[PDB]
Amino acid sequence: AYARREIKGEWGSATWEMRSVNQRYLETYFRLPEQFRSLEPVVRERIRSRLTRGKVECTLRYEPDVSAQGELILNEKLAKQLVTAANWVKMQSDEGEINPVDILRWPGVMAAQEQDLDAIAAEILAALDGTLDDFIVARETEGQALKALIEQRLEGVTAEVVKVRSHMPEILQWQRERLVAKLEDAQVQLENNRLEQELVLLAQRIDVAEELDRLEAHVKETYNILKKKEAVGRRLDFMMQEFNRESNTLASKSINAEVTNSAIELKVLIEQMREQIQNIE
Amino acid sequence: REIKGEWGSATWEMRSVNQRYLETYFRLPEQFRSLEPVVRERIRSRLTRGKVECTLRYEPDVSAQILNEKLAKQLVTAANWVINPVDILRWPGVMAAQEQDLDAIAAEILAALDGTLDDFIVARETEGQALKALIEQRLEGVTAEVVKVRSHMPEILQWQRERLVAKLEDAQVQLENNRLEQELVLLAQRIDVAEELDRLEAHVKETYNILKKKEAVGRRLDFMMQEFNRESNTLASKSINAEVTNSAIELKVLIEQMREQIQNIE
Amino acid sequence: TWEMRSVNQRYLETYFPEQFRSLEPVVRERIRSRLTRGKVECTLRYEPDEKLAKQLVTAANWVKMINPVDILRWPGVMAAQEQDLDAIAAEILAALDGTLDDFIVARETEGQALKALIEQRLEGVTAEVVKVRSHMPEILQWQRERLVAKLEDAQVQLENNRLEQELVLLAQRIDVAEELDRLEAHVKETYNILKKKEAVGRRLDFMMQEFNRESNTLASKSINAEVTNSAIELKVLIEQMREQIQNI
Amino acid sequence: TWEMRSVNQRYLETYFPEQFRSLEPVVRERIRSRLTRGKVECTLRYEPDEKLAKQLVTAANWVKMINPVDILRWPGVMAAQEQDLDAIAAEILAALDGTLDDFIVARETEGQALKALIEQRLEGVTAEVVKVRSHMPEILQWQRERLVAKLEDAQVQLENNRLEQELVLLAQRIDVAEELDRLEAHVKETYNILKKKEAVGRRLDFMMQEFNRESNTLASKSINAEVTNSAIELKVLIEQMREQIQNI
Amino acid sequence: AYARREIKGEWGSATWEMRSVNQRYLETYFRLPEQFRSLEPVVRERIRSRLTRGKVECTLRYEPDVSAQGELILNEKLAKQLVTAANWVKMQSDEGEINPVDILRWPGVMAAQEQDLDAIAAEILAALDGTLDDFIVARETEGQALKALIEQRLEGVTAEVVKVRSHMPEILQWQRERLVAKLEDAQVQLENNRLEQELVLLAQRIDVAEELDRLEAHVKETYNILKKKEAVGRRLDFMMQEFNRESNTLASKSINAEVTNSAIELKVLIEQMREQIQNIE
Amino acid sequence: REIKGEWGSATWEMRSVNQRYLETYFRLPEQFRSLEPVVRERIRSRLTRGKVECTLRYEPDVSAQILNEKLAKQLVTAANWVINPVDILRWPGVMAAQEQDLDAIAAEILAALDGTLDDFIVARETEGQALKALIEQRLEGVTAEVVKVRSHMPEILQWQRERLVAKLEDAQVQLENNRLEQELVLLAQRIDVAEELDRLEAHVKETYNILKKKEAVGRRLDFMMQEFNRESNTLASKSINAEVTNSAIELKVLIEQMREQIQNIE
């Protein structure tokens, strides 16, 4: 998701910025200020410890409060040998004045009285963790929504399985009545005892009993994966394939309009789920 | 949608390409980085599929744009005990100028996104209106080829019975292989010639009502699209006559054209 | 003081005081000469412990035929420097190699470490393999007891020559020995791949795909929750391995 | 006008007017999104067809409580520019993609071309393979006629059961059918490798090593100048192939 | 090798610099001036057409003759709106003078009257090829030396083969006299007719006749490879391995001190050659 | 070797690491780029093996260091019709200063390379003097182990004859395999026990005179070094007694220590 926090201390104001995008692995980038490039390893690990996946861009922005630094700290000794060097010229050259503003714009004469960066970073680090709290909270929140609507599709799945278990007896008699009706057009004498073994070992497979158990087993297993705190929902995308393998198993074996037209909604449910699982840790 | 306000004019531009799922990314500026999720939520709430290209930049106004009084004062003092003001000026910290007020500018900016999403939705419904038409066009052609087979059906029940009998007669003199090979093949296949015709006419019915909904029907079609072909090839490999062999081709051909016009469907 | 401050990636794309801009190619070459890949950010920490003026008089006249504020600090007074830069820079290059010692060791550290946690998942696969062999006998038994139970409610009278035929053609449906044998060989094969000193960061990635093709082969094969429930852990284990192999 | 001015190498490490420094990340991303590897040097050709001044008066007094030569040209008069930079830069990004079209085609051109000249050496190997099968029969004959000729000057009296044994154990020494069969299969295998649209620039390099192990196997096997003379051309052909495959 | 040529024309002086180092493939780098970055492809190909291997660094150095350019070309129009902008300030600010030197240091006011770069590069390209001539000549020259001393080792090789063909008859009788002498210590009865077939099929192999022919065939083939103008001496390094395979074949089969001590010089000759072949195209 | 002249002092530093072949590369500066081959030829002419690290830099002297009269003149003129001279000064083309004269400085520089090559050659002869000693040390130990086997030789001719007889007696009752397996094995191997001793004593002789030459003997040793071991393992796999088995070990052990002290030899 996203989060930022301004701080504003005795030295200046600071602002953290974290954002997260769908990535397969965990990756992080850091565009920090220049005073704190010695902190980057601590922050990186502090992230990996609380995140496991996602491309995350973490940024800190430093606004220095010049009113409190004071800067200056005149190297009075160097300025003087700048003054004397200015004098040995002003005399030999026999011309010219001596601007002090120029004498100031020497690299080593005006060192900015840097502020307790060890105290500035000490309060920043306290704010880095404070944002991760606000960041993870933003990510769990969003997680609570998908969990519900994924479990929502699961209930829609259950509505689709039992609806199929219900039409199997009605369909398998119609295939018995259809297949046999040709044997009379074939004029062939009624096998009777040889028919039954053929009608059985033809209904199985062709009748959906096995995978419905699997799909129902998948639904049970799906719920607990969403209800664990451990190695999160990356495996869900895998289950959606197993869900799908039992779905398509039903597609190329189904013998009735009524079973197939409902079996599409399944494929719809899987994909609806397959979209919201890409947002799961 | 261009807006021009009190501090300058901005311009939005949204695009869509084509993806199986919904995934938006935003390359907004950096002066305007606190809205990316707000925009994200307001966009994702209205769409279901497609890779979407969102927003460019607001060109800042200069005529609508803070010197350091205290620091400049202590700089002269350090400088005199040791005078252009312009040099005293081109120091990083004396001017700078914060000049922030995005909390008033963005409110008029954000109001246009829903206005922009309409123009995105309007553009895709527009593009959508054509596909609805030409998909229903292949269907009428489908239906025309459906009854054309339905008309030749009686000859098939006479010609396919004689095929089945040919299997029962060849198996006469032939040893007893069992009933499975000669019968489950020549019975499961004869019942189909008429059977999928019932399905296909039903597929056509089921296809049309799917098209008149306000929900997400892009995969529901593709699922149906596989169903069309599986009953089609079932009919293809049962080809005993020229007209049936040639008709199942037009069928399969009609199916595929859809598999591109459905590729643009959300 | 040298500081390497970078993770691991590919090529290497190295990154790099005002007195030492003449070393940047030298350092670049001396680093890449010893290591493979990865983006490296290199920063150092330097904290210290004329003739033209004669030719300047000439400038004052030819412009008139003047001011110290302009010509005040000259670059060439600070280029040739004041401290023997050719002797001070000498300890720097000698210490850079000294950090590289600790840099490679730092990379071997996790490298030897990632090796350890990859070997963790490898054992678990075998644990998931043998866990599969554990639920198999009851399955060929419950599917057998099921298949027979279905024919008797149907009361279809029994013929042994055909009885066995479904009992086999289901036993060869449910059978998962082939992929277990392949997979049991895969875990074995990885360890010796893990025991080479060479360029094996692709050889591992190939192996992880072998797992996925055999994981998916067995996943798309058997009949039970327990088998599919085991088939989840495999890809979970695979991806866990694949997250750490992309860094080699 | 865009200009790409770079050869082929790996990663890609892209390189890049004063009004357009705000595009450098945008261009970087839009290029790498479409291509594989190689060092690319990108240059463009741009040829064109206040409020602060008010806050400046303030500066003149607080320093005294002054000069146009200093504040003369201000940056912010030239930053916001004078021409609509937001509309002119728009044709540039649209044309960059236009050059990329011609850039990929330029790389496919040689890519389709290197493919051709690699296929040249491939045919020659087969020509060197069949050229080997050509000198074989006389060799099993001249070594046979030699071996027998050596036993008769020595006058060693002949035994057929042992005669054949050297005639075989030399015939299986001189034999080079195995590596020719392997090699004849190699050339066949390369062409279909050459007919894929994917990441085959390693698959080729593997094949060229297969050649060298079989080249060296046959080189280190037979007995004749003609065989060794043929074994030279192989590695010559291999290296010739390997010079052009390192660019894929 | 190496070559450079100064030019000095009506516009300034120019200097090419090429150097070549032992590389397996052909590679080239170009550090050109800034006025001629539009020439780099022509030069690259102009090199590949004349070179086949070697890492080559090609450099051009431009020394502009400021005396002939003249520069200036005052944008009198822009300078005036610089003057007026300077005036609208000088008046409002109520202070200050107007330096023209500052008005000059505007990017667009002083455009250096660039010189016919299309005429400068036209004479440079004529000098680029002139150096390649001097470069390749430097490389052939050096080539003529290695060719001689490699063929020099070849003669030393021939001295080593015939010296071996000469001692074979003397050695093979001593191995006959040695091997048989144990059969008497073995007390075993003299095989006679069974001995001869064993003494023959033991001398071959063990006697160096086959590979000597090969080595002599290698020497013949080596000479013509050095004497072709075509696909140059890269294959020589390969032949040195074939030379070496016949050398070592002689090492582990040799039965005499006298044959082996000479067979070392062979291995010495190969390596002496194997060093000078790394400098061959 | 440090030299200090009229325009500044320079310092050479040469190093050697260790390579099988000779290959020199030079990282000299850029002010001094016209000598790299001259130095190359003068170096390569004296060495045969080794990867060699050559030369650093000359620190330029400032007290031993050209304004534009004409351009500065036409700059003032353009400037006045429209004056600090220092600004007129910090233009790229008015000062610059060529200040070249490497044709006089390098002559004293180049003269020291032969002086430096001596110090390179002196350093390696120095390092060489130790290896010559300790290689000849393993050899005396070799010789001591040579005669120790030569002393036990008679027992071997008695013990190896009984081994050969054991092969002729086992083959008695045994079917006629032929003469090759029992005889070429047990004859080619018995003749050796004494044979390589003649070679090894000769190897030692041949080794020593190789060491007293002024030419390139580094591979001549390594060739010999393989010869030592091939007669050694021939003697190793003929091990019938404890003392012979244990003696052929010290032999092989002595050989290998050399294969490191020869690794530093040119």
- DSSP string covering E189-207, please? ---THHHHHHHHHHHTTTS
Which residue in D24, D56, D58, D63 has the most chain B C-beta atoms within 10 A of its own C-beta, making it the best mutation to test that interface?
D63
Query: Residue E129 contacts by C-beta under 8 Å, 6 or more apart in sequence?
Result: E46
Beta bridge partner(s), residue A2: A19
CA B199, CA B231: separation in Å to the nearest integer?
8
| Cα of F150 vs its chain's centroid, Å | 36
Q: Name the minimum distance, in Å, from the CA of E22 to any CA of chain D.
A: 15
Q: Are E109 and E85 in contact (CB under 8 A)?
A: no
For residue E13, list its beta bridge partners: E63
Q: What angle do CA A12, A14, A17 make, to 5 degrees?
A: 170
Nearest in space to A168 (alpha carbons), one of A62, A259, A49, A72: A259
3-state secondary structure B132-199: HHHHHHHHHHHHHHHHHHHCCHHHHHHHHHHHHHHHHHHHHHCCCCCCHHHHHHHHHCCCHHHHHHHH
Closest CA to C31 of C45, C48, C10, C16: C16
- Please report the DSSP string for A190-242 in residue order: --THHHHHHHHHHHTTTS-SHHHHHHHHHHHHHHHHTT-SSSGGGTHHHHHHH
Q: Hey, what are B232's tokens?
A: 């089609």
The structure tokens 């086949």 sit at E52
Domain boundaries, chain B: 2-62+104-122, 66-100, 129-261
Alpha helices in chain A, H assignment, sequence order? 40-48, 66-69, 76-92, 100-104, 117-185, 193-203, 210-225, 236-251, 257-276
Chains C and D touching, counted as 3 or more CB pairs less than 8 Å apart = yes
Q: Cα(D213)–Cα(D219) distance, rounded to whole angstroms?
A: 10
Backbone angles phi, psi at B60, to 5 degrees: -60, 140
Cβ B26 vs Cβ B34: under 8 Å: no
Cis before E205 (ω within 30): yes
* Residue range A144-279, CATH number: 1.20.140
How far apart are the C-alpha atoms of F166 and F157, rounded to whole Å?
14
Q: Find the largest Cα–Cα distance for chain D.
A: 129
Distance between CA atoms of residues B192 and A256, nearest Å: 11
- Among A130, A126, A121, which residue's Cα sits nearest to residue A37? A121
User: Distance (Å, rounded) from C-alpha E31 to C-alpha A188?
Assistant: 92
Q: Please name which of C179, C199, C203, C182 lies closest in space to residue C191, comparing C-alpha atoms.
A: C203
CB atoms within 10 A of CB B164: 22
Chains that touch B (3 or more CB pairs under 8 A): A, D
Helix axes F218-236, F192-210, angle to 10 degrees: 160
- B29 close to D22: Cβ distance less than 8 angstroms: no
Contact between F37 and E178 using a beta-carbon 8 Å cutoff: no
* C62 CB within 8 Å of a chain F CB: yes
Q: Quick one: how far is CA F44 from the chain centroid?
A: 14
Dihedral angle computed from the Cα positions of residues A254, A258, A264 and A270, in that order, rounded to the nearest 10 degrees: -80
Residue of C151, B179, B155 lying closest to A189 (CA atoms): B179
Q: Does F83 touch chain C (CB under 8 A)?
A: yes
Measured distance CA(D117)–CA(D95) in Å, rounded: 33
SS3 label, residue E110: strand
Nearest CB to B187 within list A105, A182, A274: A182
| Residue contact C57–A90, C-beta within 8 A | no
Tokens of F201: 């004593």
| C-alpha pair distances (Å), B181 with each of B177, C168, E37 | 7, 18, 77
Question: A48 vs chain B: nearest CA distance in angstroms?
Answer: 23
Q: Report the alpha-carbon distance of residue F21 to residue B114 in Å, rounded.
A: 74
Q: What angle do CA F208, F211, F213 make, to 5 degrees?
A: 125
Q: Which of A11, A5, A8, A7 is nearest to A119 (CA)?
A: A11
Which residues are B53's β-sheet partners? B15, B25
E39: how many CB neighbours lie within 10 A of its CB?
Answer: 19
Element (H, E) at C174: helix C160-174
Task: List, in order, residues 6 or more apart from F217 with CB less than 8 Å away.
Answer: F210, F211, F265
Q: What is the DSSP letter of A13?
A: E
Asked if residues E273 and E242 have their Cβ atoms less than 8 Å apart, the reply is no
Parallel, antiparallel, or unpaired for β A12-21 and A2-6?
A: antiparallel
The answer to whether the Cβ–Cβ distance between A97 and C69 falls below 8 Å is yes
Residues with Cβ < 8 Å from C173, sequence gap 6 or more? C223
Q: How far apart are the first and last CA of chain B?
A: 23
Instruction: Using the structure block, give the residue that is written with the tokens 């008029």.
Output: B108
Residue type, C72: L
Phi then psi for residue C235, to 5 deg, are -60, -30
Q: Distance from CA of residue F58 to its chain's centroid?
A: 29
CA distance C235 to A237: 11
Test C13 with D13 for CB contact under 8 angstroms. yes
Determine the Cα–Cα distance for residues B224 and B232; give it in Å rounded to an integer: 12
Q: Which of E81, E135, E193, E268 to mutate to test the interface with F (most CBs of F within 10 A)?
A: E268
Residue of B nearest to D79 (CA): B62
Q: Give the span between the Cα atoms of D236 and E235, in whole angstroms.
A: 6
Which of D51, D61, D62 should be substituted to probe chain B, the one whose Cβ sees the most B Cβ atoms within 10 Å?
D62
CB contact, 8 Å: C10 with chain D? yes
Query: Which chains have 3+ CB pairs within 8 A of A?
Result: B, C
Say how many CB pairs under 8 Å bridge E and F: 95
Which residues make Cβ contacts (< 8 Å) with residue A102, sequence separation at least 6?
C69, C70, C72
Beta-carbon contacts of A90 under 8 Å, excluding residues fewer than 6 positions away, are: A96, A97, A98, C68
Encoded tokens for A142: 């969003």
Chain C: list its partners (3+ Cβ pairs within 8 Å): A, D, F
Q: Which two tokens stand for residue A5?
A: 């926090």
* Contact partners, residue C64, CB within 8 Å, separation at least 6: F83, F85
Q: What is the 3-state secondary structure (H, E, C) of chain F?
A: CEEECCCCEEECCCECCCCCCEEEEECCCCCCCCCHHHHHHHHHCCCCCEEEEECCCECCCCCCCCCCHHHHHHHHHHHHCCCCHHHHHCCCCCCCCCCCCHHHHHHHHHHHHHHHHHHHHHHHHHHHHHHHHHHHHHHHHHHHHHHHHHCCHHHHHHHHHHHHHHHHHHHHHCCCCCCHHHHHHHHHCCCHHHHHHHHHHHHHHHHHHHCCCCCCCHHHHHHHHHHHHHHHHHHHCCCCCHHHHHHHHHHHHHHHHHHHHCCCCC
User: DSSP assignment, residue C67?
Assistant: -
Q: Which residue has the tokens 């006959």?
A: E176
A 10 A CB-CB count for B35 gives 18
Phi, psi of A256 (to 5 degrees): -125, 150
Structure tokens at B107: 């409110």
Q: Cα F260 to chain center, whole Å? A: 11
| Residues 6+ positions from D120 with CB-CB distance below 8 Å | none
> What residues of chain E lie within 8 A of the CB of D231, using their CB?
242
Whole-angstrom distance, CA of residue F222 vs CA of residue F218: 7
CB contact under 8 A, A200 and C150: yes
Q: Does C71 touch chain F (CB under 8 A)?
A: yes
Decide if A21 touches B, using CB distance below 8 A. yes
CB E208 within 8 A of CB E163: no
The beta strands (E) that lie in chain E are given as 2-6, 12-21, 26-31, 54-64
User: Within 13 Å and on the Cβ side, how many CA atoms surround E51?
Assistant: 32
Q: Which two tokens stand for residue D238?
A: 């291999």
- Quickly count: other Cβ atoms within 10 Å of residue F136's Cβ: 14
Query: Which residues of chain C neighbour D10 with C-beta distances below 8 Å?
Result: 11
Tell whether domain E143-279 is in CATH 1.20.140: yes
Using the beta-carbon criterion (under 8 Å), do D69 and E99 form an inter-chain contact?
Answer: yes
> Facing residues of A21 across strands?
A55
DSSP E232: G
C63 touches chain F (CB under 8 A): yes
Cβ contact, residue pair A95, C60, below 8 Å: yes
Encoded amino acid at C118, one letter: I
Distance CA F105, CA F5 (A): 8
Helix (H, G, I), strand (E, B) or coil at B2: strand
Kind and range of the H or E run holding B66: none
Q: Could you say which DSSP state residue E233 is in?
A: G
Q: Chain B residues with CB inside 8 Å of D26's CB?
A: 27
Smallest CA-to-CA distance from E61 within F193, F31, A225, A80 is with F31
Tokens encoding F173: 């009752």
In a mutational test of the E interface, the residue from F183, F217, F238 whose CB has the highest number of chain E CBs within 10 Å is: F183
Residues F259/F211, Cβ–Cβ less than 8 Å? no
Distance from F200 to chain C by nearest Cα, in Å? 38
d(CA F24, CA E223): 28
3-class secondary-structure state, position B78: helix
C-chain residue closest to D38, CA distance = C11
Distance CA D28, CA D11 (A): 13
3-state secondary structure of E256: coil
Alpha carbon distance D132, D177 (integer Å): 10
User: Which residues make Cβ contacts (< 8 Å) with residue C197, sequence separation at least 6?
Assistant: none
B184 interaction partners in chain A (CB closer than 8 Å): 198, 202
> Does residue F97 sit at the E interface (CB-CB below 8 Å)?
no
Among candidate residues D55, D60, D23, the one with its CA nearest the CA of residue D42? D23
Contacts of B164 (CB under 8 A, 6+ apart): A182, A185, A186, B186, B187, B190
Handedness of CA B115, B116, B117, B120 (dihedral sign): positive
Residues making up chain F, counted from first to last:
266
Asked if C159 has any chain A CB less than 8 Å from its own CB, the reply is yes
Q: How many CB atoms lie within 10 A of CB A53?
A: 17
E277 in D contact zone (CB under 8 Å)? no
Burial class (CB in 10 A: 0-12, 13-18, 19+), A34: exposed
B83: contact with D, CB 8 A cutoff = yes
Instruction: Report d(CA C235, CA A136) in Å as an integer.
Output: 26
First CA to last CA distance, chain A: 12
**CA pair distance A156, A269, nearest whole angstrom:** 7
Closest residue on chain D to C202 (Cα): D202
Helix (H) or strand (E) holding E266: helix E257-276
d(CA B146, CA C58): 103
Best probe of the E interface among F223, F230, F234, F266, by most E CBs < 10 A, is F223
* Other C-beta atoms lying within 10 Å of the C-beta of residue F260: 9
Taking CB atoms and an 8 Å limit, are B168 and A185 in contact across chains?
Answer: no
CB contacts < 8 A, C to D, total: 6
Q: How many alpha carbons lie under 13 Å from residue F53 in its C-beta half-sphere?
A: 7
How many angstroms separate the CA atoms of D7 and D201, rounded?
Answer: 17
Residues E89 and D68: beta-carbon distance below 8 Å: yes
Rounded-to-integer distance, Cα A175 and Cα E92, Å: 101
User: Residue F53 class from Cβ within 10 Å (0-12 exposed, 13-18 middle, 19+ buried)?
Assistant: middle
Going from the C-alpha of A262 to that of each of A175, C246, D225, the distances in angstroms are: 19, 43, 77
Structure tokens at F162: 């009984």
CA distance D69 to E214: 88
SS3 for E63? Answer: strand
Of B82, B161, B164, the CB nearest to A100: B82
Kindly list the distances between the CA atom of residue D226 and the CA atoms of D130, E91, E228, F158, in Å, as whole numbers in the listed order. 13, 98, 18, 50
**Cβ-nearest to D59 among B27, B59, B86:** B86
Q: Which residues of E touch F80 (CB under 8 A)?
A: 100
Other beta carbons within 10 angstroms of residue C195's beta carbon come to 9
Structure tokens at D172: 């299986």
Q: Helix, strand or coil for residue E147? A: helix
Q: How far apart are CA C126 and CA D130, in angstroms?
A: 50
Give me the resolution in angstroms, 1 decimal.
4.1
What residues in A contact B83, CB-CB < 8 Å?
A: 99-101
Cβ contacts of B102 within 8 Å, gap of 6 or more: B31, B32, B34
Against chain D, the chains showing at least 3 CB pairs within 8 Å are B, C, E
Q: How many CB atoms lie within 10 A of CB D65?
A: 7
Taking every pair of Cα atoms in chain E, the longest distance, rounded to a whole number of angstroms, is 134
Alpha carbon distance E137, E142 (integer Å): 9
The answer to whether the beta carbons of residues F103 and F38 sit under 8 Å apart is no
Q: What is the DSSP annotation of chain D?
A: -EEE-----SS---B--TT-TTSHHHHHHHHHTT------BEEE------HHHHHHHHHHHHTT---SSSSSS-HHHHHS-SS-HHHHHHHHHHHHHHHHHHHHHHHHHHHHHHHHHHHHHHHHHHHHHHHHHHHHHHHHHHHHHHHHHHHHHTTPPP-HHHHHHHHHHHHHHH--HHHHHHHHHHHHHHHHHTT-SSS-TTHHHHHHHHHHHHHHHHHTT---HHHHHHHHHHHHHHHHHHHHHTT-
CB contacts of E257 in chain F (<8 Å) are: 198-199, 202
Rounded Cα gap, residues E181 and E131, in angstroms = 73
In sequence order, what are the residues at sequence separation of 6 or more whose Cβ sits closer than 8 angstroms to the Cβ of residue F107? none
CB A246 within 8 A of CB A215: yes
